[PDB]
Design a protein around this ligand. Structure first.
Ligand code: CL
Ligand code: CL
Ligand code: CL
Ligand code: NA
Ligand code: NA
Length: 129
């Protein structure tokens, strides 16, 4: 599914991401925009052979099992394909683990480089929330 900006904001809010670990909703929307262009089906391979999945580009090296990332962890205890669903629940639940692991949203390179330090509230401006 390709979410609209406000549609995703509302879904993320409903799933408890607003202010989760201190990160306002606009951070999460911004991260999703630049990680996946709001596309739940986005996948991208990494140099190391892991792959990033879904709207938040969660990495099979650590977070999910895709069966082809040898020696990797599955800290979210999910098949990576679950992160591609139109239902963002699995992505959100796994993102909550990631963001809680000590590094905050710096786990998401696009967030670091394109959202952090910007007016992220712009990403939810105009949305009925
Ligand atoms: Cl915000
Ligand atoms: Cl694997
Ligand atoms: Cl933090
Ligand atoms: Na992979
Ligand atoms: Na994801």
């Amino acid at each position: 599914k390709v979410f609209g900006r406000c549609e995703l904001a509302a879904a993320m809010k409903r799933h408890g991401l607003d202010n989760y670990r201190g990160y306002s909703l606009g951070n999460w929307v911004c991260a999703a925009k630049f990680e996946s262009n709001f596309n739940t089906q986005a996948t991208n391979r990494n140099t190391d052979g892991s792959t990033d999945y879904g709207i938040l580009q969660i990495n099979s090296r650590w977070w999910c099992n895709d069966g082809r990332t040898p020696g990797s962890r599955n800290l979210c205890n999910i098949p990576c394909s679950a992160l591609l669903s139109s239902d963002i629940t699995a992505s959100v639940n796994c993102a909550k683990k990631i963001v809680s692991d000590g590094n905050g949203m710096n786990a998401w390179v696009a967030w670091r480089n394109r959202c952090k330090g910007t007016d992220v509230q712009a990403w939810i401006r105009g949305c009925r929330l």
